[PDB]
């Protein structure tokens, strides 16, 4: 007794472990735990593929579960490591199952850089192995029937998921064995054979002839359609074709023999004979043309016995007329069977080794959220500094707030005195002088490292080239040159960063020495500074003039505005929203993540409160400045211009310009310092990447 099954596909073994490990690490903090269980698992994945595929050997649900275990893992991994972003050189290689192509060869292989191909083949192998476990079952037994019926339905379904999967996944022309048509015929053969089994159960349980006829008819339909699909495409092993033919016929004959007992029960004797006669024919033909592939004797003996007896009873007793087949009513059909849908996990006891790993669909979303947060926050900071710079400059250019706290021309206007004591407290000129002094040294410290590093590479290369020169035979590894170009290109990059930093140092030095002398003035004790400021007679009617109080309250409010920018910049900076979860959600509930629109709305709930105010700050400045210059220009027409207060005037404006510069310089200087300090960090790692690669090589 003989059922069709499919042979597995052969693969060459590949290293899964290590092209995955490259991404794993280049994505996570090297040496941490979020990488510990991700290299331990990737090796256990490479192991698993080996046991799943590495040998066409084992032949039970020991080895099937291993394959199913493998399919489930291979599917769980696709939404991680960027497969859908072709850069991983994991190339999978399978051979046709049947030794088939669309040319007259004797085998054909196909290697592809796609997980989609990998998974189509594994499933085909899951289906084929299932087909083999099913065809082996002892069908006299209830566990036998149950297991055949379940595996055939599994196989049919696995083959059909392939039919619907292949072309969209695999971006090439597949081998014949996994093409839609082949795999669609295989699916139907498996479905047919599942019916066959349900027919055999019903027979064994002695169910009604009505039921049995209909199950057999249905099997016959299924084998027929499969036969037809085979008739003009020879893409299956040569034995599939005759065997479908015989099974179709046997199924028809089984259908008729049962329908014929039913007719005898209803006393349609001519009919019984007509159906018996058709069964005898089908079996006669089967026995003689498909002997090789079937045994049909018992059935044939039983048909003949029924036929002789029915003809005896008829010829002598009943005298019923025997109809032509065309006038017989169709036997009905009953399927009891379905293609099993494929829904991972298809394996018992499944656990996703890499469950913890975050989907790439999120990484890209999470990293691209940052570059929109950054763009929003920096943008807003910059606008605000650019505005404060401009206001302070305009104020200076109009001697404000100095001019209105300037009772006589005799003392240090309160504001200047505040700014002075402010300068003196922050350390005065020493704090700017000491930061200028150490800047060439932080530059030099970073040059040292870049150079010590590349010279390592140079020295090692000089000798590798000499060893190749003098020991041709004994010394052959890829030259240092090639191994080193990646590092050396980081090298020339760093160089560019240094050249920009030097230019930046240039701007700060020139500014610093362009503004030193005045700053030094501002830092003097109160009377010493008062002596150095020229005195003037005041324009005395500045008692309580309306232009003065207006300017005053307007300055109080411009002040207000700029002191508020500090707490804005701090709230802009001190908050953030972790977005992972929002993406995780949008991925689980919906199909994909669209961060574009999902971030724009969250950036608005998080930052909108502050971005609103930042804009309200600028317009409020523009407002306050427009009607301060008009209010000033009128103020000046009230306080005349002579030499003694022009002199006081410039010194005053220049002392205010001096305050701005000190504050700005400290900030540029500290920025330079921080930069040169973070840069040493980056360059020490680079120094070690260099020495490690000279110590390995």
């Amino acid at each position: 007794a003989t059922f069709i099954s499919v042979q597995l596909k052969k693969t060459s073994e590949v290293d899964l472990a290590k092209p995955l490990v490259k991404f794993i690490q280049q994505t996570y903090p090297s040496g941490g735990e979020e990488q510990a269980q991700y290299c331990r698992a990737a090796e256990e994945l490479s192991k698993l593929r080996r046991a799943a595929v590495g040998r066409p050997l084992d032949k039970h649900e020991g080895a099937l579960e291993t394959l199913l275990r493998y399919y489930d893992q291979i599917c769980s991994i696709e939404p991680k490591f960027p497969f859908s972003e072709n850069q991983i050189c994991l190339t999978f290689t399978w051979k046709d199952a049947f030794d088939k192509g669309s040319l007259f060869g004797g085998s054909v292989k196909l290697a592809l850089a796609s997980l989609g191909y990998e998974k189509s083949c594994v499933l085909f192998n899951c289906a084929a192995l299932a087909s083999q476990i099913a065809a082996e079952q002892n069908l006299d037994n209830d566990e036998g029937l149950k297991i055949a019926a379940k595996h055939y339905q599994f196989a049919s379904g696995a083959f059909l998921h392939i039919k619907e999967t292949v072309l969209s996944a695999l971006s090439r022309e597949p081998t014949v064995d996994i093409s839609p048509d082949t795999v669609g015929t295989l699916s139907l053969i498996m479905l047919a054979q599942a019916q066959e089994v349900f027919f055999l159960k019903a027979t064994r349980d002695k169910m009604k002839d009505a039921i049995i006829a209909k199950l057999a008819n249905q099997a016959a339909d299924y084998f027929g359609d499969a036969f037809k699909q085979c008739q003009y495409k020879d893409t299956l092993p040569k034995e599939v074709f005759p065997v479908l033919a015989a099974k179709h016929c046997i199924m028809q004959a089984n259908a008729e023999y049962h329908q014929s007992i039913l007719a005898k029960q209803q006393y349609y004797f001519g009919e019984e004979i007509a159906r018996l006669q058709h069964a005898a024919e089908l079996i006669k033909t089967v026995a003689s043309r498909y002997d090789e592939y079937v045994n049909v004797k018992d059935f044939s003996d039983k048909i003949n016995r029924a036929l002789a007896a029915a003809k005896k009873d008829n010829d002598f007793i009943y005298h019923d007329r025997v109809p032509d087949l065309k006038d017989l009513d169709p036997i009905g059909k009953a399927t009891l069977v379905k293609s099993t849908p494929v829904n991972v996990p298809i394996s018992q006891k499944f656990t996703d080794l890499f469950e913890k790993m975050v989907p790439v669909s999120v990484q890209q979303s999470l990293a691209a959220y940052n570059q929109r947060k950054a763009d929003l926050v920096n943008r807003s900071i910059a606008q605000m500094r650019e505005a404060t710079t401009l206001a302070n400059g305009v104020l200076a250019s109009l001697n404000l707030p100095a001019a209105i706290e300037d009772v006589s021309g005799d003392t240090v206007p309160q504001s200047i005195l505040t700014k002075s004591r402010s300068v003196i407290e922050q350390g005065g000129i020493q704090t700017v002088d000491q930061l200028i002094k150490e800047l060439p040294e932080l530059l030099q410290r970073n040059r040292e490292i870049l150079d010590e590093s590349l010279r390592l590479l140079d020295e090692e290369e000089a000798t590798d080239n000499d060893l190749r020169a003098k020991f041709k035979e004994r010394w052959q590894r890829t030259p240092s040159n090639e191994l080193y170009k990646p590092l050396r290109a980081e090298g020339t990059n760093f160089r560019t960063v240094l050249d920009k930093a030097v230019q930046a140092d240039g701007q700060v030095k020139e500014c610093y020495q362009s503004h030193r002398d005045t700053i030094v003035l501002l830092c003097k004790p109160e009377p010493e500074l008062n002596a150095a400021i020229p005195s003037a007679n005041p324009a005395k009617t500045m008692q309580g003039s309306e232009v003065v109080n207006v300017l005053k309250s307007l300055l109080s409010n411009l002040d207000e505005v700029k002191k508020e920018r500090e707490g804005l910049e701090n709230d802009l900076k001190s908050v953030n929203f972790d977005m992972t979860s929002k993406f995780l959600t949008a991925l689980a509930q919906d199909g994909v993540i669209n961060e574009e629109a999902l971030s724009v709305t969250e950036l608005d709930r998080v930052y909108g409160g502050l971005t609103t105010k930042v804009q309200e700050s600028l317009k409020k400045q523009e407002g306050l400045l427009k009607n301060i210059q008009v209010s000033h220009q009128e103020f000046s027409k009230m306080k005349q211009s002579n030499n003694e207060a022009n002199l006081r005037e410039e010194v005053l404006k220049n002392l205010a310009t001096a305050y701005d510069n000190f504050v700005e310089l400290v900030a540029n200087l500290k920025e330079g310092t921080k930069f040169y300090n973070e840069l040493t960090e980056i360059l020490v790692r680079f120094q070690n990447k260099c020495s490690d690669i000279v110590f390995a090589r």
Binding site: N493, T496, V497, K500, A501, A504, Q507, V508, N668, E671, G672, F675, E678, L679, I682
Partner: peptide, 11 residues
């Protein structure tokens, strides 16, 4: 932009 903290932080 004064000192290149752009180039710096990406590396």
């Amino acid at each position: 932009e004064l000192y290149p903290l752009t180039s710096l932080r990406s590396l």
